[PDB]
């Protein structure tokens, strides 16, 4: 045959591989360390027409790398902070009654304990206000203490691990970070408006770096996320399996106003030489329970849109019902998130309290604030959130939910969906749904009518 | 008739050099040695035999043993770094002798000490008790204190990691190669007539011992004796066994482990009341096979020290317990056996089991460092392990007895000899692909 | 009829850029970590560059900032394995010192007593130590506490390492070069007519001084004045000498170092007692040499302010002792000398030594770092230290009315100004081998 082989270096070819994507920011905030290289002012988004790439989630390594990277960043941020080891003492607490209300009865404890000063031989007696979710009674025996008696309490992390305290000079704001691919690798962005969780993307477009990915941390509702293009989306590994989380993405956002009406005061005591413990001071004004406000009409319309999209994956004549969480610890059974340095644990039982039949006003969500947070389902690495002075306000965009299908039903009856959220990787899976790293192979062979000339 | 120098790339030319070797292990929770982060090894390592080449191998000078010692020390310190430090344990202990089912040999070996320890709360303490061996406690003036109290504080080893010597392979980087001497009768120094290259060496178990080479590599055809100077009394003359003998070391005491909350989030695993009778730990070695191996050793020593010269194996010459007792690790606990029963004979020309009493220490200094120590936690249950000894680290005694009555006694406090008994066949060379040679060819002018 | 572009690889084209330089030492532990540094070349020959001038610019190059960060990092890393002085923050009952206290040292030394823990944490001991007045503060015989108790606890300096400044060399890596200037009339900035290329810079002494440059280089022709803006009094004036003067800083107090066992293995070296006589530490500099050196400064300094002007040397403007006093270190003892006797004269247009009272501080916090810091152990015996004054750091005053009476006071803003006086000739640069130039060449095609 008159055909011979010819080699071409530079051929466009793709291969699935795992690499260490580096970050990029628009540019103290040591949570991101600010040492990351800045992003380019003009991100080139090259469109790749006439080609279809098979995109698949729940197995992508970018979400796993982001989870490990944010864990390492959190550990590095908490590394130079002050350890709260001497705080494990017998706390003589009592219930607070200074302008207390009915809903906050017993939720705040006025504790008193001995503390160390800058000198080891001298000690000081300080007073702090700890929440009911941060203290546990030491000697629960010898009961019948007078109604107003100083019971003895201790921190929850005392018998697990003496962890650090979050430094006040750093902020936990979700600063967007862009994950870029190194040399010899590319990031393929699927710009399909109706992209489904697993399948070949019709319109694929490469890019050097992803868009602004805000590393928001939540368990039930996706806050400050990326909305859909034109219609809300629902994704799951196996829609017929009840053991898989049902990810949901919205197309329009619902404004949620979270606040803490307590005018908190922060007092700093010298726990030791050069180390200071920011304790909770006296409350100024009345004490009220922190909550979040969600519009009734907007939430009902969003729920109706989700119900409409839930009628195509299952039978459209099925009764879709919404129930609250099944139970467990407060880290998963409640909507946990951060709001201006203060951690909230909202009860979303009022949101998922409706049923749907195939035929202004607002709702208040009671939230509780906790100071000891493991933050990554750990058992020996927690953190202490210092109190924030003044009131706290937050305006977020709930762009999605992490639902869990409750199986066991039959004959297409009473199909209930409860909110869930296990690993924190599911929160970032709804943001990295369009990206997929690929390894390019510039070497390739082909036949052409050539031959090496003999010189 | 004309010659022109030409350049050849990729020539098979190597030179001796020093470099950092890789890590390689099977893909088979934690480990004190190379963890899961180590690079996995290939299931089919390539071994290319090389003929017509006589490489000059030389142990005791190669950087493989030094690099292994350095990275083993680094791995040990890195594994002990996140563990809980035992610095608040420096308190006065009111110890007393144990008499519950005591024996005639274990009298006074264990001390039942009680002390005031801090609990999870800073303003509260507890009165706990623990059983400490006599070798890690010293009197103050009933009041005792730890042996490491007046020195650097020890770090309690985490129970999650294990001291099991998982074999590792030292792979050479790109541009370097590992040459393995295939000669069966190859001693420590000399040109090996059968050298074969290899990408990565075989499984080297990082087991540390002081007098017997435990779980080592066996000789291919006969017992080999290697030493830098066979005429010098020093330099730690070591041997290698062609066949292994079984040794059964055990701790018959059914010990238990109790957890004491030393601090907030820290737990001090102490020793509780043992179940059953007490007994001294020992190692069993069959007299017949050990006598046969000793008979092979004298036969291999007579060719180096001359015939009709009677030789004598005796026990150590004094020093601390680390050099005078056969120290090793079995299941997690560290043993210190009196090996005087093995090296006790006099071999004269033309010629059921041996029990060795052992002592167990909790606070030890594994390496030759005073500022770094580690408290081994007591593991519950009966300890029992069977291993193979494939070599001894002997030492001669100076004298002018006209080459007669040569006394051989164990020793070798250095760990690098143990490490070198496996890395003797391997060496590191640096490949030099650039080469120049003349040929009758001229580059045309274009 | 035209030319064609022809590329050249390896052209001598430079571009100013910042690059992290690597160390180079003679390899003769050290506080600057000489072991963790690449050994220097036996003879780093220089390449003189003719027919070329390079625009040098000081106070903007990244070499001084890189050296500053390297010195801080090396100082912290060499201090990291030392023991921590955290239990020392307790109440100290101090009294004045006896044994013929002099008038100058009256109240400058205190005899503090405090309770400390022994090797056992359940036992206390009453130990005493001698602390200077600058290291203790009263609590409102009286109770005292260390000055580093409300800030961070300071690690003691390991006696095994020394504070002698070992000369280090900075070299540019592959693809970079460090050009050096060689003319005698070198300005602060501007072009240099004698530029030379050398692989590694000369021996830079990492000395820490705040008022007078110590153990530095000397000018080959005359005293030179360097400043970013000589008309601006906010910028420090860097002065260097051509002939250095000798200073004789002694510590007549013959003290004894006492080791206090504060914990397991760790020891706190405290000042035991003054067995000898008590006297104030001082530095001796000849009045004739200092007067001649000041006479050379005015001659080479009046060119920037006129000949008929009158300049006056005053002492420090006021502030902290560590920024207003000449701070250095000789043999482990940190001094703080009052230079009011040196800069005290008036110059008009045309027994023999000056003593300087110096204070001794143990808990010193070098650089501008506040949290991190160090405790200097007392050095036993009489301290003798001689050195060369190779430069000054001056600072002018504001106003500058009626074009006369220009008062000059010593400065001492940052440590960078010390290394700036030594790295004045050197400047890092980046080479570019790519070059484009036209010629009549044309590539032949097939």
């Amino acid at each position: 045959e008159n055909l011979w082989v010819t080699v071409y270096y530079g051929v466009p070819v793709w291969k699935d591989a795992e690499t260490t994507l580096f970050c990029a920011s628009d540019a103290h905030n040591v949570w991101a360390t600010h040492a990351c290289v800045p992003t380019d002012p003009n991100p080139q988004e090259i469109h790749l027409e006439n080609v279809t790439e098979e995109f698949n989630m729940w197995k992508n390594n970018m979400v796993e790398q982001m989870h490990t990277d944010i864990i390492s960043l959190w550990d590095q941020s908490l590394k130079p902070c002050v350890k709260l080891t001497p705080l494990c003492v017998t706390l003589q607490c009592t219930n607070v009654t200074n302008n207390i209300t009915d809903d906050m009865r017993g939720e705040l404890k006025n504790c008193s304990f001995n503390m160390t000063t800058e000198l080891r031989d001298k000690k000081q007696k300080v007073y702090s206000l700890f929440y009911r979710l941060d203290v546990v009674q030491i000697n629960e025996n010898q009961g019948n203490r007078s109604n107003n008696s100083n019971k003895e309490y201790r921190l929850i992390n005392c018998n697990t691990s003496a962890c650090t305290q979050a430094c006040p000079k750093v902020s936990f704001e979700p600063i967007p970070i862009h994950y870029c691919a190194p040399a010899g690798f590319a990031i393929l962005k699927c710009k399909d408006k109706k992209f489904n969780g697993t399948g070949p993307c019709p319109s694929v477009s490469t890019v050097q770096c992803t868009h602004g990915i805000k590393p928001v941390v939540s368990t039930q509702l996706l806050l400050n996320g990326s909305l859909a293009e034109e219609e809300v989306m629902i994704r799951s590994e196996n829609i017929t399996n009840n053991a898989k989380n049902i990810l949901v993405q919205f197309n329009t956002p619902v404004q949620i106003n979270c606040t803490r009406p307590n005018n908190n005061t922060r007092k700093s005591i010298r726990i030791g030489p050069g180390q200071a413990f920011y304790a909770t001071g006296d409350i100024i004004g009345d004490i009220r329970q922190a909550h979040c406000n969600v519009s009734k009409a907007t939430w009902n319309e969003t729920l109706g849109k989700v119900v409409k999209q839930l009628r195509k994956h299952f039978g459209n004549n099925t009764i879709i019902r919404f129930a609250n969480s099944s139970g467990g610890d407060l880290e998963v059974t409640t909507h946990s998130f951060n709001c201006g340095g203060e951690f909230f644990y909202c009860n979303t039982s009022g949101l998922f309290n409706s049923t749907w039949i195939s035929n202004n006003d607002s709702i208040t969500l009671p939230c509780r604030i906790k100071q000891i947070i493991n933050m990554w389902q750990r058992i020996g690495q927690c953190m202490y959130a210092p109190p924030i002075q003044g009131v706290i306000r937050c305006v977020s965009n709930i762009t999605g939910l992490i639902l869990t299908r409750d199986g066991g039903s039959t004959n297409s009856t009473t199909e209930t969906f409860r909110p869930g959220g296990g690993d924190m990787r599911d929160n970032w899976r709804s943001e990295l749904y369009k990206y997929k790293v690929v390894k390019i192979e510039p070497l390739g062979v082909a036949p052409t009518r050539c031959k090496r000339r003999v010189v | 008739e004309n010659l022109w120098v030409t350049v050849y790339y990729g020539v098979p030319v190597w030179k001796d050099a020093e470099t950092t070797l890789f890590c390689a292990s099977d893909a088979k929770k934690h480990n004190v040695w190379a963890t899961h982060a180590c690079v996995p090894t290939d299931p089919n390592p390539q071994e290319i035999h090389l003929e017509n080449v006589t490489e000059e191998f030389n142990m005791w000078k190669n950087n493989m043993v030094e690099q292994m010692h350095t990275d083993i020390i680094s791995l040990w310190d890195q594994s002990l770094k996140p563990c809980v430090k035992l610095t608040p344990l420096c308190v006065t202990l009111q110890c007393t002798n144990v008499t519950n089912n005591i024996t005639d040999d274990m009298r006074g070996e264990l001390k039942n000490c009680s002390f005031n320890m801090t609990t999870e709360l800073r303003d509260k303490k507890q009165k706990v008790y623990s059983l400490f061996y006599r070798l890690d406690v010293v009197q103050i003036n009933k009041e005792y204190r730890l042996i490491n109290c007046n020195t650097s504080a020890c770090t309690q080893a985490c129970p999650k990691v294990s001291f099991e010597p998982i074999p590792i392979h030292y792979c050479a980087p790109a541009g370097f190669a590992i040459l393995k001497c295939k000669d069966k009768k190859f001693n420590g120094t000399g040109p090996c007539p059968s050298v074969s290259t290899v990408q990565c060496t075989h499984g080297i178990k990082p087991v540390v011992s002081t007098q017997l080479l435990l779980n080592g590599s066996l000789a291919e055809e006969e017992v080999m004796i290697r030493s830098e100077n066979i005429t010098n009394n020093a330099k730690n003359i070591l041997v290698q066994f062609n066949t292994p003998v079984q040794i059964n070391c055990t701790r018959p005491n059914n010990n238990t482990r109790k957890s004491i909350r030393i601090g907030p989030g820290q737990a001090f695993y102490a020793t509780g009341d043992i179940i059953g009778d007490i007994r001294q730990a020992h190692c069993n070695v069959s007299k017949a096979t050990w006598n046969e191996t000793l008979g092979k050793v004298v036969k291999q020593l007579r060719k180096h020290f001359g015939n009709n010269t009677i030789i004598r194996f005796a026990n150590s010459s004094g020093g601390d317990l680390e050099v005078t007792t056969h120290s090793f690790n079995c299941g997690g606990e560290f043993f210190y056996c009196n090996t005087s029963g093995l090296f006790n004979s006099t071999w004269i020309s033309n010629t059921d089991s041996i029990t060795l009493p052992c002592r167990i220490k909790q606070i030890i200094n594994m390496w030759q460092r005073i500022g770094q120590c580690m408290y081994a936690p007591p593991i519950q249950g009966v300890i029992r392990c069977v291993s193979n000894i494939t070599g001894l680290i002997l030492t001669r005694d100076g004298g002018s007895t006209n080459s007669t009555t040569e006394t051989f006694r164990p020793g070798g406090g250095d760990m690098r000899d143990n490490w070198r008994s496996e890395l003797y066949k391997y060496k590191v060379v640096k490949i030099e692909p650039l080469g120049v040679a003349p040929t009758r060819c001229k580059r045309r002018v274009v | 009829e035209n030319l064609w572009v022809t590329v050249y690889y390896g052209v001598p084209v430079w571009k100013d850029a910042e690059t992290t330089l690597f160390c180079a030492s003679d390899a003769k532990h050290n506080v600057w970590a000489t072991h963790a540094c690449v050994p220097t070349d036996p003879n780093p020959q220089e390449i003189h560059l003719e027919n070329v001038t390079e625009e040098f610019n000081m106070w903007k190059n990244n070499m001084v900032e890189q050296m500053h960060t390297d010195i801080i990092s090396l100082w912290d890393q060499s201090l990291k394995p030392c023991v921590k002085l955290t239990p020392l923050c307790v109440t100290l009952q101090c009294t004045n010192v006896t044994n013929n206290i002099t008038d100058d040292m009256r109240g400058e030394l205190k005899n503090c007593s405090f309770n400390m823990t022994t090797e056992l944490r359940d036992k206390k001991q009453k130990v005493y130590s001698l602390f200077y007045r600058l290291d203790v503060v009263q609590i409102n015989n009286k109770e005292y506490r260390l000055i580093n108790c409300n800030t961070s606890a300071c690690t003691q300096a390991c006696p095994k390492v020394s504070f002698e400044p070992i000369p280090i060399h900075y070299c540019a890596p592959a693809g970079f070069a460090i050009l050096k200037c060689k003319d005698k009339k070198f300005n602060g900035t501007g072009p240099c007519p004698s530029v030379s290329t050398v692989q590694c810079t000369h021996g830079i002494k990492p000395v820490v001084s705040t008022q007078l440059l110590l153990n530095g280089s000397l000018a080959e022709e005359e005293v030179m004045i360097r400043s970013e803006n000589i008309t601006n009094n906010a910028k420090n004036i860097l002065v260097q000498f051509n002939t250095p003067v000798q200073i004789n800083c002694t510590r007549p107090n013959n003290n004894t170092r006492k080791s206090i066992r504060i914990g397991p293995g760790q020891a706190f070296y405290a000042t035991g007692d003054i067995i000898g006589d008590i006297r104030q530490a001082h530095c001796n500099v000849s009045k004739a040499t200092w007067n001649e050196t000041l006479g050379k400064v005015v001659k080479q300094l009046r060119k920037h302010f006129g000949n008929n002007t009158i300049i006056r040397f005053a002492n420090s403007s006021g502030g902290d002792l560590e920024v207003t006093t000449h701070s250095f270190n000789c043999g482990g003892e940190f001094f703080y000398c009052n230079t009011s006797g040196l800069f005290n004269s008036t110059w008009i247009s045309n027994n023999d030594s000056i003593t300087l009272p110096c204070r001794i501080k143990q808990i010193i916090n070098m650089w501008q770092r506040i949290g991190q810091c160090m405790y200097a152990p007392p050095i036993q015996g009489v301290i003798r230290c001689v050195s060369n004054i190779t430069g000054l750091i001056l600072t002018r005053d504001g106003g500058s009315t009626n074009s006369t009476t220009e008062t000059f006071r010593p400065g001492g803003g940052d440590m960078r100004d010390n290394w700036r006086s030594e790295l004045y000739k050197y400047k890092v640069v980046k080479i570019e081998p790519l070059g484009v130039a036209p010629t009549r060449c044309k590539r032949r095609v097939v």
Partner: antibody
Amino acid sequence: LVTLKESGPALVTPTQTLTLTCTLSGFSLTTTGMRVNWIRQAPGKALEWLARIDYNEARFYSSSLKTRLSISTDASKNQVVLRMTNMAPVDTGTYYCARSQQHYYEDAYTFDWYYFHSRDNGLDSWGQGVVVTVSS
Amino acid sequence: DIVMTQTPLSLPVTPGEPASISCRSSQSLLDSDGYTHLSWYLQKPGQSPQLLISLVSNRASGVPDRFSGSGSGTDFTLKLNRVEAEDVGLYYCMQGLQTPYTFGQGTKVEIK
């Protein structure tokens, strides 16, 4: 030495509030582990613990007599006052007072005052006791 | 409340003869820290009660050496090696595990 003395009305009419004043000598209730108890004894019968007050104003009473007992103290004059409402004639007997402590110990390393247990650890000293007669 | 039982009601013994007073509880008095809380008190005729033993075995300061106590769980005995002519009186037991504290019925000691 530590001594305790009690005082109050010897003859108390029925259905009248009975008060008892206890004077502390040699010690103070402001100490980190001191606590004063109250035990009454009927004529020819067993003792009966009535109430106690801790250092942190922790008041403990009996289960059967919780609605009738009321204990209080002040750090000014260092005295403990026990109030008993609705006195019955069967309540006639000797009323004693006692002293107990948590036995706080000081550490040698750190200077924190610790303890081994958080209970009474025995009633060290006892008062002389007064005789309260409930009759018309 | 924890009911305390004391046997016997009366203990008539001769001087110099050993005697023992038994005691029981409804539940175990062992604290979570490993301490058994139980104390013994002696009430002399015409005098206020005084502490004898604390924490079952720890003797009080200034009390005679002849007084001793032992037991664990729900059984506690107060062993007296020698009974003197001054040791006559009422012996009471007490539990310090939890409030309210309950005393025993007493053990009157009278010379034979």
